Amino acid sequence: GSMSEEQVAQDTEEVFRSYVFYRHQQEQPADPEMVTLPLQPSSTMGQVGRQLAIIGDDINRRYDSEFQTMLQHLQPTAENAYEYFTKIATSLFESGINWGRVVALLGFGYRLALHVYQHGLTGFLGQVTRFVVDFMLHHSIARWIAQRGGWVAALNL
């Protein structure tokens, strides 16, 4: 059978945390938690997170001004982040799941966590990690990923 949704949830924690670290470095305050990963960065899921941050670099830089402006208006903090994350992610996936949208969610998690840290003065990366993992679990994305062979599929389209 396919890998479990539970395995994908574990994998997602590693892909996200690796993605956040490597995305921050190529955009070069870093939240110090970002240097703590679930597993070594050379693990398979560590490598996937790194590659996804690389692949997205140019696209992300093109939307930076827009996104910064939008987050300045929303003012995410620890007190509203779950509501804002939930509403935004649900709208992202309303029409269906695809890889680009799944990777975009990692980028949203990055931006949300960095904003709450830089502007809201609160380290929130572990919490955003859980939001991302749990959203994928509960919205069929972990299962969709598992049925395509896991996160490695994103690099092999």
Partner: peptide, 23 residues
């Protein structure tokens, strides 16, 4: 309200572009 849906629209646009880059 209004800003949340605009972030979602921006992420959908990013998603489309990432789909193209991954393929």
């Amino acid at each position: 309200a209004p800003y949340l849906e605009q972030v979602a629209r921006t992420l959908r646009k990013i998603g489309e572009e990432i789909n193209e880059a991954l393929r």
